[PDB]
C-alpha cells in the first residue's frame, strides 16, 4: 500500500469552534496565573458522589465497580481535587494550585442518559508569591481565590457577582455563591476547617463553576469606548454600619443614587476595632465620578454626592 | 540640589542582581492535554472538525452502531462499565463519530477528530487505568482509500515523534473496520537497531486504524457503494509515556505537582 | 463555634486581582486571519521589512517608469533599497524559491511603510496581511470564495459585502471588496508577468492574491477614531482588548 | 461570479512553524503576567537610533524623512517603549507594563540590506499587585523585572 492523502472537494477551513477556542484561551489564562491543569477520575465513592452538589439530583453508580472508590460518577470535581491536594501536601508539596475542566454527572431517572455538565474548578493552598530574601510571602486567602475566579470572568468578558452562601464542606464564613446574569453558577470558598483537618491541610480554597452556563453566554465582539476626554472627580467616604452589612449593599445604594456621573466605587479600607461602637464596622469607599461629555463642576458632583450620602444615612450608614 | 541627589542615588543604590528574582509562577498544561492539542492542530490544518460528545453512552452507539451485535465478546459486562443493561461508560470515542456520522444524513465529507476520556473495567497498575484518554478520527468521503489512511497516519507519527518518523502497518482485526491494521512508528530514540523504548525492535505500536466497515456506514445512513471511510484511534496516555519515558500510567491521574510542573515549557524538534 | 464566627469574611470585598495583559488589537486581527488560513492548508510566511526595489516593485509589475516607485511616496534609503510598501515582496521571494513548482498558498503579515504625513487615518508605518495562491487551475471564483471566507471571519457571516471590479498592476482581473459600503480587501488574479518573472509558467499556473489592512479593519470593527492610537500604547487603549470574543447572539 | 474554493491536490496540514508557535505561546505568557502588547514605530530620531545598542553598528537612515522623529531605524526597542511610558505617566496612568517583540536594524553598509533582528523587550513601572483594603501594594522593582525574564526563559525552556 502506497501512501497518499485524501483530497476533499467540499472545502472547509478547519477551526476550533468558539467554545473550543475560549477553552484553550481560558486554560492559558489559568496557567498564566500559576495553576496546574489537573486530570482526575470521574468515578468516586458512592458517599462522595454528592459532595458539593448544588441540586439534589440523582447519582449514577456502576453495576459492577472494580473498586469502592470508583463506583459512582461525581457530581463535583472537588472531591478528587481535594484528595490530590491532601496527597501533595502529605508529600511535603505545600504549595498546590490546580484547576480542572471536567464533567459531572446527574442522573436522569431510570434508563435515560444522565445530564453531563462541564465544570471549571480548582483548588489553592500555600503561598501565592514568595521571595524570602525580600520578605515577600503572600499566603493564598479567599480573596486571591476570588481573584482567580475574577480573572476567569475578565478573560471571558463576563461579570460574576458574589453573595455569601452556605455549602456543606466549606467554611460557613468564607463561602461565596458566584452568579452570572443573576443565576448561581458555582461558588468559591475556603474548605471547612474540619474537612481541611481531616486531609491534614492548611487554609485551602476551591472554586467550582458551571462552565456550560458560562459558555452559553454570547459575548460578541469587544466594546471599544474612546478614552474619556475629561478628568473625573474622586470623593472618599467612611461609612459606619453594622458589622454584617456586606459591602455590596453599600455599593448598590451608591450606584442607585449616582445618577449619570457615578462611574465606580471601590472599598479601600474596612475598620473593626475599639475605636468604634462594638458591632459596627467602618467601611471606606472611594467614589469615582465621570461625565464623558463634560467637565465636572464641584457643584454638580456635590449635588449627587449629597443625594448618595442621604440615601446611605437613611439606610443606617453614618458618616 | 538635583545633581546631588542623583549622585547619592548612584552611590547608594547598587544591588546584587544575581539575587533571586521575584517569581511569577506558570502552571502546567497536563501532558495528556498537550498531546491531544498537537493532534487537533495537525487535523485542523487539514480541514477537520474537533467533536466532543457523551462519556456515558448507550450500547447502541458504543457497540451496535459500531458493528458489535448483541452477541460479541466485547459487549462483555465484565470488560466494560455498565450502569444498566443498555447504558455504559463509553469504551472508546467512536460512538461520538457514529452519532455525528448519522446526523450527516448520508452526505460527505465527514472528517472529524474526537479526543476524550474512555473507560475500561480493569484494575489499575503501572500500565492500566480504568479511565484513560483516546483520540479517534473518522474520515468518510467518496473515493477514500487505504493509501489515504496511510498518508494521514504518517502525518500523525511525524507530528508526535518527529519529521523523520516512518510508520509500519500490520494486519489485524477490529469489528468496525476492514481492512484493519495496527500501526508502529519507527523509534525516535535509536535511529535503527533497537533500544529499550522500542524493545530492540525499531518499531513502536501507537495507533490502530482501518477502512470503515460497510455495516457501520450503512447503519449511520451512508451508502457504502458510493462512500468509503477510514478511522483510527490512539492513546495519549501511552503516547506520553513512550514520548517522555513516563513509567506508570497512574502518574497522570495523581496530580503530584512535582510531576505536573515538569511540563511547563514549549517544545521543538531539536536537531 | 466562635472560631467560625470570628473567621467570617465579607466575601463581597475586592478580590486580589491577578492582572491580565492585552494582545494588541492589530495582532488579534492578524492571528484570526492566520488561523483561518492555517485550516485551509496555507503557510504563514515572514520576510524582510527593508527590501530591494526589484522585489517591492519590479517583481510586482511596476517597472522603473511607474508612479508607484515615486521617491515622494515611499521611504527610500538608497535608490535601490526602501522600507517595503506592502508584504508582496515576501510573496514574490517565496514564489521564486519554489522554482516553478506549486502549489503556493501563503499568507504574509507585517509592517509596511508609506511616505506620508500621519493623521487620524494615515500612519507612515501600518500593518498589512497579503495572501497568494498559485496552482494549476486557479480561477477567480476560487478568489471569490476565499474572499468571502475572510469577510465572514472578520465581520461575521451575515455581514453584507460588495465586490467591485477594479485594477492593480500586479493582478488582472482585479476586485475590491466593501463591507456594508466600506472598502477592506483588494485582490485579483495574479498577472502573468508576475508569475512569469518569479519563474512560474502562466500557461500552466494561475494565481490569486489579496491584501487587507488590520489597522483599517480594526478601526472599522471597533470604531477606533484615530489610527495613531494603535502606535501610542496608552494603557487605557490596550486594556480594552483583554477579553475573548465570540460571533455573538 | 460563481463562489468557489480552490482544492489543492497537493495536500498539507496548515500549521504554525515551531518558531511561530513559541511566539504565540510566549506572548500569552507575557499577557498572563500582566504585560500589554505594545506596537511602536520602527523609525526614531537619528539621535536615538543607537541608544542601548549592544552592538556598535551603523544605523540605517532614510533619504527623505517626513519627520525628524522618524528619520532612522531603531537599534533598540526601548526608546519608543520609554517614550510610551512617559506618555502614559504624563496622562496619569502610573502603572505601565508593556512588552514588544519587533525588529531593530543594523547597517551592513554599502547598498546592502541591513541585518534585521527580532528583539523581545518591555518596560515596567508602578504597582504590580494591589488590594488596598487588605494593605497589599507590591511595587515593581528590579526583581520583578527579573521574574518576567525568568518566566520567559522558564516558558521557552531556556537557561539564562
Ligand atoms: O473505527 C473507529 N475507530 C478505530 C478504528 C480502528 C482502530 C481503533 S483503535 O486502535 O483505537 N481501537 C479501539 C477499540 N479497540 C476495540 C474495540 C472494540 C472491539 C475490539 N477492539 C481496538 C483498538 C479505532 N471509529 C469509528 N467511529 C465511527 C465509525 S468507525
Ligand atoms: O497581488 C498582490 N496583492 C494584492 C493584490 C490586489 C490588491 C492588494 S491590496 O489591496 O493590498 N493593495 C496594496 C497595493 N496597492 C497598490 C500598490 C501599487 C500600485 C497600485 N496599487 C493597491 C492595494 C494586494 N500581491 C502579490 N504579491 C506577490 C505576487 S502578487
Ligand atoms: Zn529504539
mmCIF file of N, CA and C in Angstrom, chain C residues 127-233:
data_model
loop_
_atom_site.group_PDB
_atom_site.id
_atom_site.type_symbol
_atom_site.label_atom_id
_atom_site.label_comp_id
_atom_site.label_asym_id
_atom_site.label_seq_id
_atom_site.Cartn_x
_atom_site.Cartn_y
_atom_site.Cartn_z
ATOM 1 N N UNK C 127 0.060 48.137 9.310
ATOM 2 C CA UNK C 127 0.214 46.696 9.154
ATOM 3 C C UNK C 127 -0.520 46.274 7.866
ATOM 4 N N UNK C 128 -0.118 45.135 7.311
ATOM 5 C CA UNK C 128 -0.814 44.535 6.186
ATOM 6 C C UNK C 128 -0.750 43.012 6.287
ATOM 7 N N UNK C 129 -1.821 42.366 5.841
ATOM 8 C CA UNK C 129 -1.815 40.953 5.506
ATOM 9 C C UNK C 129 -2.080 40.797 4.013
ATOM 10 N N UNK C 130 -1.128 40.199 3.303
ATOM 11 C CA UNK C 130 -1.282 39.736 1.920
ATOM 12 C C UNK C 130 -1.416 38.214 1.892
ATOM 13 N N UNK C 131 -2.026 37.693 0.844
ATOM 14 C CA UNK C 131 -2.011 36.268 0.593
ATOM 15 C C UNK C 131 -1.719 36.010 -0.872
ATOM 16 N N UNK C 132 -1.267 34.796 -1.155
ATOM 17 C CA UNK C 132 -1.003 34.407 -2.517
ATOM 18 C C UNK C 132 -1.396 32.946 -2.608
ATOM 19 N N UNK C 133 -2.292 32.659 -3.550
ATOM 20 C CA UNK C 133 -2.428 31.309 -4.053
ATOM 21 C C UNK C 133 -1.978 31.173 -5.505
ATOM 22 N N UNK C 134 -0.999 30.301 -5.747
ATOM 23 C CA UNK C 134 -0.641 29.828 -7.089
ATOM 24 C C UNK C 134 -0.749 28.311 -7.264
ATOM 25 N N UNK C 135 -1.584 27.883 -8.211
ATOM 26 C CA UNK C 135 -1.801 26.469 -8.507
ATOM 27 C C UNK C 135 -2.334 26.354 -9.944
ATOM 28 N N UNK C 136 -2.442 25.126 -10.442
ATOM 29 C CA UNK C 136 -2.626 24.891 -11.859
ATOM 30 C C UNK C 136 -3.917 25.473 -12.423
ATOM 31 N N UNK C 137 -5.081 25.129 -11.889
ATOM 32 C CA UNK C 137 -6.275 25.785 -12.431
ATOM 33 C C UNK C 137 -6.952 26.833 -11.527
ATOM 34 N N UNK C 138 -6.188 27.762 -10.968
ATOM 35 C CA UNK C 138 -6.828 28.761 -10.119
ATOM 36 C C UNK C 138 -7.643 29.685 -11.019
ATOM 37 N N UNK C 139 -8.897 29.904 -10.616
ATOM 38 C CA UNK C 139 -9.894 30.725 -11.264
ATOM 39 C C UNK C 139 -10.460 31.717 -10.248
ATOM 40 N N UNK C 140 -11.043 32.799 -10.744
ATOM 41 C CA UNK C 140 -11.445 33.961 -9.986
ATOM 42 C C UNK C 140 -12.557 33.628 -9.023
ATOM 43 N N UNK C 141 -13.373 32.653 -9.396
ATOM 44 C CA UNK C 141 -14.385 32.112 -8.480
ATOM 45 C C UNK C 141 -13.716 31.565 -7.202
ATOM 46 N N UNK C 142 -12.507 31.032 -7.350
ATOM 47 C CA UNK C 142 -11.725 30.487 -6.232
ATOM 48 C C UNK C 142 -11.307 31.629 -5.332
ATOM 49 N N UNK C 143 -10.930 32.740 -5.970
ATOM 50 C CA UNK C 143 -10.676 34.009 -5.287
ATOM 51 C C UNK C 143 -11.925 34.462 -4.558
ATOM 52 N N UNK C 144 -13.047 34.481 -5.267
ATOM 53 C CA UNK C 144 -14.246 34.999 -4.655
ATOM 54 C C UNK C 144 -14.556 34.215 -3.389
ATOM 55 N N UNK C 145 -14.654 32.897 -3.500
ATOM 56 C CA UNK C 145 -14.790 32.006 -2.346
ATOM 57 C C UNK C 145 -13.918 32.289 -1.136
ATOM 58 N N UNK C 146 -12.614 32.440 -1.338
ATOM 59 C CA UNK C 146 -11.668 32.757 -0.266
ATOM 60 C C UNK C 146 -11.931 34.125 0.365
ATOM 61 N N UNK C 147 -12.118 35.143 -0.471
ATOM 62 C CA UNK C 147 -12.554 36.439 -0.002
ATOM 63 C C UNK C 147 -13.820 36.436 0.836
ATOM 64 N N UNK C 148 -14.807 35.611 0.513
ATOM 65 C CA UNK C 148 -15.994 35.588 1.362
ATOM 66 C C UNK C 148 -15.713 34.956 2.706
ATOM 67 N N UNK C 149 -14.816 33.983 2.722
ATOM 68 C CA UNK C 149 -14.406 33.413 3.997
ATOM 69 C C UNK C 149 -13.697 34.416 4.887
ATOM 70 N N UNK C 150 -12.778 35.162 4.290
ATOM 71 C CA UNK C 150 -12.108 36.241 5.005
ATOM 72 C C UNK C 150 -13.108 37.203 5.620
ATOM 73 N N UNK C 151 -14.058 37.661 4.811
ATOM 74 C CA UNK C 151 -15.050 38.608 5.305
ATOM 75 C C UNK C 151 -15.856 37.980 6.427
ATOM 76 N N UNK C 152 -16.259 36.740 6.195
ATOM 77 C CA UNK C 152 -17.016 36.010 7.199
ATOM 78 C C UNK C 152 -16.254 35.892 8.521
ATOM 79 N N UNK C 153 -14.943 35.680 8.444
ATOM 80 C CA UNK C 153 -14.164 35.544 9.657
ATOM 81 C C UNK C 153 -14.020 36.867 10.396
ATOM 82 N N UNK C 154 -13.881 37.952 9.637
ATOM 83 C CA UNK C 154 -13.617 39.275 10.189
ATOM 84 C C UNK C 154 -14.891 39.862 10.771
ATOM 85 N N UNK C 155 -15.985 39.799 10.019
ATOM 86 C CA UNK C 155 -17.134 40.633 10.362
ATOM 87 C C UNK C 155 -18.371 39.768 10.558
ATOM 88 N N UNK C 156 -18.201 38.457 10.636
ATOM 89 C CA UNK C 156 -19.346 37.549 10.767
ATOM 90 C C UNK C 156 -20.056 37.289 9.449
ATOM 91 N N UNK C 157 -20.990 36.341 9.424
ATOM 92 C CA UNK C 157 -21.352 35.681 8.163
ATOM 93 C C UNK C 157 -22.515 36.366 7.462
ATOM 94 N N UNK C 158 -23.254 37.166 8.228
ATOM 95 C CA UNK C 158 -24.456 37.855 7.766
ATOM 96 C C UNK C 158 -24.073 39.252 7.308
ATOM 97 N N UNK C 159 -22.817 39.611 7.539
ATOM 98 C CA UNK C 159 -22.344 40.940 7.213
ATOM 99 C C UNK C 159 -22.385 41.043 5.696
ATOM 100 N N UNK C 160 -22.859 42.177 5.192
ATOM 101 C CA UNK C 160 -23.109 42.257 3.764
ATOM 102 C C UNK C 160 -21.863 42.829 3.113
ATOM 103 N N UNK C 161 -21.444 42.229 2.008
ATOM 104 C CA UNK C 161 -20.237 42.678 1.346
ATOM 105 C C UNK C 161 -20.546 43.009 -0.116
ATOM 106 N N UNK C 162 -19.619 43.716 -0.763
ATOM 107 C CA UNK C 162 -19.756 44.223 -2.120
ATOM 108 C C UNK C 162 -18.448 44.081 -2.907
ATOM 109 N N UNK C 163 -18.549 43.421 -4.054
ATOM 110 C CA UNK C 163 -17.423 43.096 -4.904
ATOM 111 C C UNK C 163 -17.518 44.077 -6.053
ATOM 112 N N UNK C 164 -16.432 44.795 -6.348
ATOM 113 C CA UNK C 164 -16.385 45.811 -7.405
ATOM 114 C C UNK C 164 -15.178 45.601 -8.288
ATOM 115 N N UNK C 165 -15.408 45.533 -9.610
ATOM 116 C CA UNK C 165 -14.257 45.440 -10.489
ATOM 117 C C UNK C 165 -13.314 46.605 -10.227
ATOM 118 N N UNK C 166 -12.021 46.389 -10.421
ATOM 119 C CA UNK C 166 -11.068 47.453 -10.220
ATOM 120 C C UNK C 166 -9.826 46.985 -10.920
ATOM 121 N N UNK C 167 -8.678 47.462 -10.461
ATOM 122 C CA UNK C 167 -7.476 47.397 -11.272
ATOM 123 C C UNK C 167 -6.264 47.619 -10.372
ATOM 124 N N UNK C 168 -5.285 46.724 -10.463
ATOM 125 C CA UNK C 168 -3.987 46.900 -9.815
ATOM 126 C C UNK C 168 -3.030 46.391 -10.866
ATOM 127 N N UNK C 169 -1.804 46.923 -10.894
ATOM 128 C CA UNK C 169 -0.754 46.480 -11.810
ATOM 129 C C UNK C 169 -0.407 44.988 -11.802
ATOM 130 N N UNK C 170 -0.405 44.407 -10.609
ATOM 131 C CA UNK C 170 0.122 43.071 -10.368
ATOM 132 C C UNK C 170 -0.970 41.995 -10.482
ATOM 133 N N UNK C 171 -2.228 42.415 -10.591
ATOM 134 C CA UNK C 171 -3.302 41.477 -10.882
ATOM 135 C C UNK C 171 -4.188 41.870 -12.072
ATOM 136 N N UNK C 172 -4.854 40.876 -12.648
ATOM 137 C CA UNK C 172 -5.879 41.141 -13.658
ATOM 138 C C UNK C 172 -6.528 39.827 -13.947
ATOM 139 N N UNK C 173 -7.865 39.787 -13.913
ATOM 140 C CA UNK C 173 -8.763 40.820 -13.413
ATOM 141 C C UNK C 173 -8.619 41.136 -11.911
ATOM 142 N N UNK C 174 -9.240 42.208 -11.436
ATOM 143 C CA UNK C 174 -8.971 42.628 -10.068
ATOM 144 C C UNK C 174 -10.291 42.984 -9.420
ATOM 145 N N UNK C 175 -10.273 43.212 -8.113
ATOM 146 C CA UNK C 175 -11.516 43.311 -7.358
ATOM 147 C C UNK C 175 -11.226 44.124 -6.113
ATOM 148 N N UNK C 176 -12.265 44.780 -5.627
ATOM 149 C CA UNK C 176 -12.286 45.382 -4.316
ATOM 150 C C UNK C 176 -13.528 44.877 -3.611
ATOM 151 N N UNK C 177 -13.376 44.698 -2.306
ATOM 152 C CA UNK C 177 -14.499 44.230 -1.522
ATOM 153 C C UNK C 177 -14.798 45.330 -0.528
ATOM 154 N N UNK C 178 -16.060 45.721 -0.459
ATOM 155 C CA UNK C 178 -16.520 46.617 0.582
ATOM 156 C C UNK C 178 -17.278 45.773 1.568
ATOM 157 N N UNK C 179 -17.323 46.238 2.805
ATOM 158 C CA UNK C 179 -18.299 45.721 3.747
ATOM 159 C C UNK C 179 -19.322 46.816 4.037
ATOM 160 N N UNK C 180 -20.546 46.409 4.372
ATOM 161 C CA UNK C 180 -21.676 47.332 4.438
ATOM 162 C C UNK C 180 -21.471 48.468 5.425
ATOM 163 N N UNK C 181 -21.279 51.268 2.516
ATOM 164 C CA UNK C 181 -20.201 50.429 1.987
ATOM 165 C C UNK C 181 -18.828 50.992 2.280
ATOM 166 N N UNK C 182 -17.940 50.147 2.800
ATOM 167 C CA UNK C 182 -16.565 50.495 3.164
ATOM 168 C C UNK C 182 -15.574 49.455 2.625
ATOM 169 N N UNK C 183 -14.543 49.917 1.919
ATOM 170 C CA UNK C 183 -13.563 49.022 1.310
ATOM 171 C C UNK C 183 -12.632 48.353 2.320
ATOM 172 N N UNK C 184 -12.394 47.047 2.189
ATOM 173 C CA UNK C 184 -11.489 46.369 3.108
ATOM 174 C C UNK C 184 -10.429 45.478 2.462
ATOM 175 N N UNK C 185 -10.764 44.854 1.338
ATOM 176 C CA UNK C 185 -9.859 43.896 0.721
ATOM 177 C C UNK C 185 -9.672 44.354 -0.701
ATOM 178 N N UNK C 186 -8.436 44.252 -1.180
ATOM 179 C CA UNK C 186 -8.122 44.392 -2.584
ATOM 180 C C UNK C 186 -7.602 43.030 -2.984
ATOM 181 N N UNK C 187 -7.845 42.640 -4.223
ATOM 182 C CA UNK C 187 -7.414 41.325 -4.653
ATOM 183 C C UNK C 187 -7.476 41.213 -6.175
ATOM 184 N N UNK C 188 -6.841 40.196 -6.736
ATOM 185 C CA UNK C 188 -7.055 39.909 -8.160
ATOM 186 C C UNK C 188 -6.473 38.563 -8.547
ATOM 187 N N UNK C 189 -6.592 38.197 -9.812
ATOM 188 C CA UNK C 189 -5.852 37.072 -10.333
ATOM 189 C C UNK C 189 -4.456 37.553 -10.624
ATOM 190 N N UNK C 190 -3.436 36.822 -10.199
ATOM 191 C CA UNK C 190 -2.080 37.352 -10.350
ATOM 192 C C UNK C 190 -1.771 37.543 -11.833
ATOM 193 N N UNK C 191 -1.215 38.704 -12.172
ATOM 194 C CA UNK C 191 -0.838 38.987 -13.546
ATOM 195 C C UNK C 191 0.276 38.039 -13.989
ATOM 196 N N UNK C 192 0.153 37.458 -15.191
ATOM 197 C CA UNK C 192 1.163 36.544 -15.703
ATOM 198 C C UNK C 192 2.578 37.058 -15.740
ATOM 199 N N UNK C 193 2.766 38.356 -15.928
ATOM 200 C CA UNK C 193 4.132 38.882 -15.942
ATOM 201 C C UNK C 193 4.714 38.562 -14.567
ATOM 202 N N UNK C 194 3.855 38.646 -13.553
ATOM 203 C CA UNK C 194 4.248 38.393 -12.161
ATOM 204 C C UNK C 194 4.577 36.909 -11.957
ATOM 205 N N UNK C 195 3.723 35.996 -12.432
ATOM 206 C CA UNK C 195 4.052 34.557 -12.468
ATOM 207 C C UNK C 195 5.335 34.369 -13.277
ATOM 208 N N UNK C 196 5.359 34.928 -14.484
ATOM 209 C CA UNK C 196 6.481 34.691 -15.384
ATOM 210 C C UNK C 196 7.819 35.173 -14.817
ATOM 211 N N UNK C 197 7.811 36.339 -14.179
ATOM 212 C CA UNK C 197 9.010 36.866 -13.520
ATOM 213 C C UNK C 197 9.556 36.076 -12.335
ATOM 214 N N UNK C 198 8.684 35.366 -11.629
ATOM 215 C CA UNK C 198 9.159 34.647 -10.447
ATOM 216 C C UNK C 198 9.231 33.168 -10.780
ATOM 217 N N UNK C 199 9.091 32.871 -12.071
ATOM 218 C CA UNK C 199 9.588 31.639 -12.672
ATOM 219 C C UNK C 199 8.490 30.605 -12.780
ATOM 220 N N UNK C 200 7.240 31.039 -12.685
ATOM 221 C CA UNK C 200 6.152 30.128 -12.999
ATOM 222 C C UNK C 200 5.756 30.264 -14.465
ATOM 223 N N UNK C 201 5.124 29.206 -14.964
ATOM 224 C CA UNK C 201 4.633 29.166 -16.332
ATOM 225 C C UNK C 201 3.156 29.483 -16.238
ATOM 226 N N UNK C 202 2.776 30.630 -16.796
ATOM 227 C CA UNK C 202 1.455 31.222 -16.626
ATOM 228 C C UNK C 202 0.472 30.539 -17.561
ATOM 229 N N UNK C 203 1.010 29.705 -18.455
ATOM 230 C CA UNK C 203 0.215 28.766 -19.239
ATOM 231 C C UNK C 203 -0.269 27.561 -18.452
ATOM 232 N N UNK C 204 0.522 27.185 -17.452
ATOM 233 C CA UNK C 204 0.181 26.116 -16.515
ATOM 234 C C UNK C 204 -0.433 26.641 -15.214
ATOM 235 N N UNK C 205 0.222 27.621 -14.601
ATOM 236 C CA UNK C 205 -0.227 28.093 -13.301
ATOM 237 C C UNK C 205 -0.998 29.377 -13.415
ATOM 238 N N UNK C 206 -2.121 29.433 -12.713
ATOM 239 C CA UNK C 206 -2.734 30.723 -12.416
ATOM 240 C C UNK C 206 -2.595 31.047 -10.917
ATOM 241 N N UNK C 207 -2.991 32.240 -10.494
ATOM 242 C CA UNK C 207 -2.851 32.610 -9.087
ATOM 243 C C UNK C 207 -3.947 33.557 -8.654
ATOM 244 N N UNK C 208 -4.169 33.711 -7.353
ATOM 245 C CA UNK C 208 -4.839 34.906 -6.854
ATOM 246 C C UNK C 208 -4.145 35.466 -5.602
ATOM 247 N N UNK C 209 -4.291 36.775 -5.409
ATOM 248 C CA UNK C 209 -3.635 37.459 -4.324
ATOM 249 C C UNK C 209 -4.627 38.467 -3.771
ATOM 250 N N UNK C 210 -4.324 38.987 -2.586
ATOM 251 C CA UNK C 210 -5.203 39.887 -1.849
ATOM 252 C C UNK C 210 -4.336 40.592 -0.825
ATOM 253 N N UNK C 211 -4.831 41.729 -0.343
ATOM 254 C CA UNK C 211 -4.228 42.448 0.757
ATOM 255 C C UNK C 211 -5.410 42.996 1.521
ATOM 256 N N UNK C 212 -5.206 43.196 2.809
ATOM 257 C CA UNK C 212 -6.126 43.988 3.599
ATOM 258 C C UNK C 212 -5.263 44.630 4.683
ATOM 259 N N UNK C 213 -5.834 45.574 5.423
ATOM 260 C CA UNK C 213 -5.103 46.338 6.417
ATOM 261 C C UNK C 213 -5.727 46.231 7.785
ATOM 262 N N UNK C 214 -5.099 45.469 8.688
ATOM 263 C CA UNK C 214 -5.640 45.316 10.025
ATOM 264 C C UNK C 214 -5.893 46.642 10.781
ATOM 265 N N UNK C 215 -5.118 47.684 10.512
ATOM 266 C CA UNK C 215 -5.308 48.974 11.185
ATOM 267 C C UNK C 215 -6.704 49.453 10.805
ATOM 268 N N UNK C 216 -6.991 49.391 9.514
ATOM 269 C CA UNK C 216 -8.299 49.752 8.975
ATOM 270 C C UNK C 216 -9.476 48.853 9.328
ATOM 271 N N UNK C 217 -9.331 47.551 9.116
ATOM 272 C CA UNK C 217 -10.249 46.577 9.700
ATOM 273 C C UNK C 217 -10.579 46.835 11.166
ATOM 274 N N UNK C 218 -9.557 47.004 11.999
ATOM 275 C CA UNK C 218 -9.832 47.217 13.427
ATOM 276 C C UNK C 218 -10.565 48.516 13.738
ATOM 277 N N UNK C 219 -10.143 49.596 13.075
ATOM 278 C CA UNK C 219 -10.797 50.894 13.253
ATOM 279 C C UNK C 219 -12.286 50.781 12.941
ATOM 280 N N UNK C 220 -12.589 50.275 11.754
ATOM 281 C CA UNK C 220 -13.936 49.914 11.333
ATOM 282 C C UNK C 220 -14.691 48.994 12.290
ATOM 283 N N UNK C 221 -14.072 47.886 12.691
ATOM 284 C CA UNK C 221 -14.760 46.955 13.567
ATOM 285 C C UNK C 221 -15.060 47.578 14.930
ATOM 286 N N UNK C 222 -14.118 48.316 15.509
ATOM 287 C CA UNK C 222 -14.365 48.830 16.863
ATOM 288 C C UNK C 222 -14.811 50.285 16.964
ATOM 289 N N UNK C 223 -14.729 51.019 15.858
ATOM 290 C CA UNK C 223 -14.948 52.462 15.814
ATOM 291 C C UNK C 223 -13.800 53.224 16.467
ATOM 292 N N UNK C 224 -12.596 52.671 16.366
ATOM 293 C CA UNK C 224 -11.373 53.363 16.740
ATOM 294 C C UNK C 224 -11.182 54.585 15.840
ATOM 295 N N UNK C 225 -11.149 55.764 16.452
ATOM 296 C CA UNK C 225 -11.274 57.011 15.701
ATOM 297 C C UNK C 225 -9.971 57.542 15.095
ATOM 298 N N UNK C 226 -8.828 57.009 15.514
ATOM 299 C CA UNK C 226 -7.541 57.559 15.105
ATOM 300 C C UNK C 226 -6.575 56.377 15.085
ATOM 301 N N UNK C 227 -6.018 56.133 13.906
ATOM 302 C CA UNK C 227 -5.113 55.025 13.669
ATOM 303 C C UNK C 227 -3.880 55.141 14.551
ATOM 304 N N UNK C 228 -3.612 56.332 15.067
ATOM 305 C CA UNK C 228 -2.335 56.509 15.772
ATOM 306 C C UNK C 228 -2.461 55.962 17.151
ATOM 307 N N UNK C 229 -3.686 55.815 17.645
ATOM 308 C CA UNK C 229 -3.936 55.118 18.903
ATOM 309 C C UNK C 229 -3.280 53.738 18.978
ATOM 310 N N UNK C 230 -3.098 53.100 17.821
ATOM 311 C CA UNK C 230 -2.521 51.785 17.742
ATOM 312 C C UNK C 230 -1.048 51.856 18.103
ATOM 313 N N UNK C 231 -0.429 53.015 17.896
ATOM 314 C CA UNK C 231 1.040 53.109 17.973
ATOM 315 C C UNK C 231 1.497 54.032 19.097
ATOM 316 N N UNK C 232 0.510 54.500 19.851
ATOM 317 C CA UNK C 232 0.709 55.332 21.028
ATOM 318 C C UNK C 232 0.816 54.554 22.332
ATOM 319 N N UNK C 233 0.092 53.443 22.452
ATOM 320 C CA UNK C 233 0.288 52.496 23.565
ATOM 321 C C UNK C 233 -0.128 53.068 24.916
#
